[PDB]
Amino acid sequence: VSKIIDIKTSIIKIPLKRTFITAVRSTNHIDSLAVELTLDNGVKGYGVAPATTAITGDTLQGMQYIIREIFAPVILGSDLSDYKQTLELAFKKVMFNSAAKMAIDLAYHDLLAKEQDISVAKLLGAKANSIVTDVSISCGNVAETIQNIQNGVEANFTAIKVKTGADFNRDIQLLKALDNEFSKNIKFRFDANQGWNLAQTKQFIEEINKYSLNVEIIEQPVKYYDIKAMAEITKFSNIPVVADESVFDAKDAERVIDEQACNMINIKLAKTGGILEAQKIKKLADSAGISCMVGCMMESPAGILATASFALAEDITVADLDPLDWVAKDLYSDYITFNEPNIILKDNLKGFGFNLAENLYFQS
Amino acid sequence: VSKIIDIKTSIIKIPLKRTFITAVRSTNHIDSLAVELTLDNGVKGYGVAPATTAITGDTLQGMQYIIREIFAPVILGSDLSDYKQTLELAFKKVMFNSAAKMAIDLAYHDLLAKEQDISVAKLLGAKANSIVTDVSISCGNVAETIQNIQNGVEANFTAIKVKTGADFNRDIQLLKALDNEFSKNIKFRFDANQGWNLAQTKQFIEEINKYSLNVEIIEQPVKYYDIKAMAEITKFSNIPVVADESVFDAKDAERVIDEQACNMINIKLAKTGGILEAQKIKKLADSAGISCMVGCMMESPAGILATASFALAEDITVADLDPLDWVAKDLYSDYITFNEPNIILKDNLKGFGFNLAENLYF
């Protein structure tokens, strides 16, 4: 019987190699909070979550307070084997702030795996160690956008996630350029980040039909709450429609399933508040015959490893896991081999294998 | 034209006279963040919002960061007259954190009113100065609860909000005790804070009908997201059903209107992110023939004043505004006369009429 006797955090700031721009925001960096749980046997578990305030509403400052002043009193002194009960009772005290919850759920999984002397991926039941990711391309003018895609293709990515929804006229013009520049061995994924209205979405889909493109998904074309439009688009489209911001948790998944509002759900740990809730979504989706992909915020490689581990355990093969491509290799090379576009888990790691304490000063 | 050239924040904590406890939480104090906006003509304006993390997810520390580092760059240097656009631009950078938005929205309205040398209530179109509130009663054992109610009645409240949803057997037994101790001059409002399932809700409603009791509303009996159950309870019930946690913003209001999931919406500024979004809810409800009441978190008298101002401007007469009853009179006596159960705005205040001098400058 191991008990959690300490909880500490540290902020992590990472610079991006190039500017990330979506319909929602623009950034050159990632802000994350790491949490450390210490067992009474000295073993330490870790989780890392992004603060993407425009999407999940999380802030580093809110996460720190929640974890150290709200969750901590519930967790401290509790048995590791009571994790499900502990997380349920702790999470009930906080509405939203899903990324804060992600950090805690991940640290618990790290502990659970380490206590069994296995990786988290293995704990969750993964067989495979490799998942393929697209690379995503910032909003920008057509010329710049074609250049970024060529860079991705030269880097060995054949699945390309094209951000749209910032400028609809630009989005339409871009299709022409794509059709001219790339073959059908390149697979496109469009993600509007809610930036289109219903009419524009249908128009974009009709426009795709005018060219010869390999298009795999249309992701979150409209506002997260316009489930009626999502259903209409899903019925209209010959291309699978993906819900992202429309689905954070299991009850969101129930709603989109009930309303036939997508063909596929993009599961993200920063939205679900960690692995436990993501598992519940996957079960619901499976029962409903809805497929799942995994995705992320522009977030640290640690979140990517955790997400890859989950996907491998759940037989999820469609992934937008690209942040590794936006940051320095040394940030992930302790735990991941990225042979683009393949994210490969390194062998024989205990827990996730993040190796955070070496570079970060944790404080209670 | 006036431009906003400075933004400051301050944390304010206030003690409660007695313990507030619901199905949600238990507390002896209020945590608030206040924001001050300064125009380049010297006029300052203020808004104050609660951090009730279990409900809106807001934290003091989160609100502080959001206002200083996210909202401030958008607001600073902007024209006051552009406020609708400025707030739209600012709020699109932040999901949730509605109480942080409330603080900023209120400070803008304080400025707007002060620029016209009038109260915010007057700015919003209010004429009347007074609104009746219930008093709310903490969860407790039956005997405890009867005593708290008697205290309220003795204090002159005739509308009583009874918190339920923590212990269902207690809730059911309590009805017998109410029917025994009280006549129909006392009107009850039950708020389960989501604590009941569908079966329990129908049972409580049937139980009510076994007695002689004046029952005005049943509030948020089930989970905020179970709209199907809300719609079923609404159809089943002979008592008006109120959506609280099911409606934060206008798009939430559209959903409950579309699904016929309530008879009435409880509008709170801490959920709406301030007055502009609250006005949009009111317009939608009006169009759908859905009534509105106003409500609050357990929050500062400044928030209560802002909410009373909105209600008076919107012809909303049903209110659960009680926190004034939970704090020392000298906190609010400058801008409000609470002669129970009447919340009455003082004459000739400019803007809201509260200031931060003790917090910021002393």
A217: domain CATH number is 3.20.20.120
Do residues B35 and B97 both lie within one domain? Answer: yes
Do residues B121 and B100 both lie within one domain? Answer: no
For residue A286, what are its two tokens?
A: 């499976």
d(CA B183, CA A240): 61
Which positions ≥6 away from B356 have C-beta within 8 Å?
B10, B34, B36, B46
- Could you tell me the CA-to-CA distances from B79 to A278, B82, B276 in Å, in that order? 45, 5, 17
Do residues B232 and B294 both lie within one domain? Answer: yes
Do residues B284 and B209 both lie within one domain? Answer: yes
Q: Which residue has the tokens 């709603």?
A: A255
Counting one residue from chain A and one from chain B, the pairs whose CB atoms sit within 8 A come to 64
Number of domains present in the structure of chain B? 2
Do residues B134 and B210 both lie within one domain? Answer: yes
Please judge whether B97 and A57 are an interchain contact, meaning their C-beta atoms are less than 8 angstroms apart.
Answer: yes
Q: Is the dihedral of CA B343, B347, B350, B353 positive or negative?
A: negative
Domain CATH for A64: 3.30.390.10
d(CA A213, CA A229): 25
- A341: preceding bond cis by omega (within 30 degrees): yes
B7-17: buried (b, 16+ CB within 10 Å) or exposed (e) per residue? bbbeebebebe
- The phi, psi pair for B14, rounded to 5°, reads -130, 135
Residue A100, amino acid:
A
Beta bridge partners of B131: B343
d(CA B137, CA B222): 19
Do residues B318 and B305 both lie within one domain? Answer: yes
For residue B25, what are its two tokens?
A: 């939480």
Do residues A132 and A77 both lie within one domain? Answer: no
d(CA B269, CA B55): 13
Residue from A243, A164, A154 nearest A175 by CA: A164
Pick the residue of A31, A56, A61, A91 with the most B CBs within 10 A to test the interface with B by mutation.
A61
If interface means Cβ-Cβ distance under 8 Å, which residues of chain A face chain B? Answer: 25, 53-57, 59-62, 64-66, 70, 92-97, 225, 251, 255
For residue B199, what are its two tokens?
A: 């079966």
Q: Which chain A residue lies closest to B62 (C-alpha atoms)?
A: A62
Pairing between β-strand A264-267 and β-strand A135-137 as defined by DSSP bridges: unpaired
- C-alpha dihedral over B292, B293, B297, B302, to 10 degrees? 110
Q: Are A162 and A174 in contact (CB under 8 A)?
A: yes
- The structure was resolved experimentally with X-ray
Q: Which chain B residue lies closest to A67 (C-alpha atoms)?
A: B59
Q: A56 to chain B: which residues are within 8 Å by CB?
A: 95-96
Beta bridge partners of B54: none
Q: Which residue has the tokens 């307070």?
A: A65
For residue B90, what are its two tokens?
A: 């600012």
Residue from A302, A269, A331 nearest A101 by CA: A269
Please judge whether A95 and B65 are an interchain contact, meaning their C-beta atoms are less than 8 angstroms apart.
Answer: no
A115-152: buried (b, 16+ CB within 10 Å) or exposed (e) per residue? beebbbbbbbebeebebebbbbbbbbeeeebbebbeeb
User: At what resolution in Å was this solved?
Assistant: 1.9
Query: Is B110 assigned a ligand-binding role in the annotation?
Result: no
Q: How many CA atoms lie within 13 A of A124 on its CB side?
A: 28
Residue from A146, A190, A132 nearest A166 by CA: A190
d(CA A23, CA A54): 11
d(CA B119, CA B114): 7
For residue B219, what are its two tokens?
A: 């509030």
- Report the residue from A54, A66, A70 with minimal CB separation from B94: A54
B68-106: buried (b, 16+ CB within 10 Å) or exposed (e) per residue? eebbbebbeebebeebeebbeebbeebbbbbbbbbbbbb
Do residues A123 and A101 both lie within one domain? Answer: no
Do residues B131 and B32 both lie within one domain? Answer: no
Helices first, then strands: H and E counts in chain B:
16, 13
Residue B79, amino acid:
D
Please judge whether A53 and B61 are an interchain contact, meaning their C-beta atoms are less than 8 angstroms apart.
Answer: no
d(CA A333, CA A304): 12
Q: B93 to chain A: which residues are within 8 Å by CB?
A: 25, 53-54
E-assigned strand segments in chain B: 4-21, 26-39, 44-50, 130-132, 135-137, 159-163, 187-191, 214-219, 241-243, 264-267, 291-294, 336-339, 342-345
Query: Is B249 assigned a ligand-binding role in the annotation?
Result: no
Q: Cα angle vertex B336, ends B330, B340, to 5°?
A: 90
Q: B92 to chain A: which residues are within 8 Å by CB?
A: 54
- Residue A346, number of CB atoms within 10 A of its CB: 15
Q: Cα angle vertex A76, ends A75, A81, to 5°?
A: 60
- C-alpha dihedral over A219, A224, A228, A231, to 10 degrees? 20
Strands of A264-267's sheet in order across:
A135-137, A159-163, A187-191, A214-219, A241-243, A264-267, A291-294
Whole domain around residue A182: which residue ranges?
117-364
Domain boundary among A101, A116, A131: A116
A23 vs chain B: nearest CA distance in angstroms?
Answer: 11
Q: B60 to chain A: which residues are within 8 Å by CB?
A: 65
Query: Is A219 assigned a ligand-binding role in the annotation?
Result: yes
Pick the residue of B66, B74, B89, B96 with the most A CBs within 10 A to test the interface with A by mutation.
B96
Q: Are B67 and B35 in contact (CB under 8 A)?
A: yes
Question: Could you give the 3-state DSSP secondary structure of residue B246?
Answer: coil
B115 vs chain A: nearest CA distance in angstroms?
Answer: 32
Q: Is the dihedral of CA A334, A340, A345, A347 positive or negative?
A: negative
d(CA A107, CA A6): 12
Pick the residue of B33, B53, B254 with the most A CBs within 10 A to test the interface with A by mutation.
B53
| Long-range pairs of B256-261 with CB within 8 A, sequence gap ≥ 24 | B256/B227, B256/B230, B256/B290, B257/B284, B257/B285, B257/B288, B257/B290, B259/B227, B259/B228, B259/B230, B259/B231, B260/B231, B260/B234, B260/B235, B261/B227, B261/B230, B261/B231, B261/B234
Do residues B42 and B185 both lie within one domain? Answer: no
Pairing between β-strand A291-294 and β-strand A336-339 as defined by DSSP bridges: unpaired
For residue A93, what is the enclosing H or E element? none
- The phi, psi pair for B264, rounded to 5°, reads -155, 145
d(CA B175, CA B352): 40
Do residues A103 and A246 both lie within one domain? Answer: no
For residue B344, what are its two tokens?
A: 């009455």
Question: Could you give the 3-state DSSP secondary structure of residue B296?
Answer: coil
B113-145: buried (b, 16+ CB within 10 Å) or exposed (e) per residue? bbbeebbbbbbbebeebebebbbbbbbbebeeb
Do residues A223 and A355 both lie within one domain? Answer: yes
Residue from B91, B119, B69, B77 nearest B280 by CA: B91
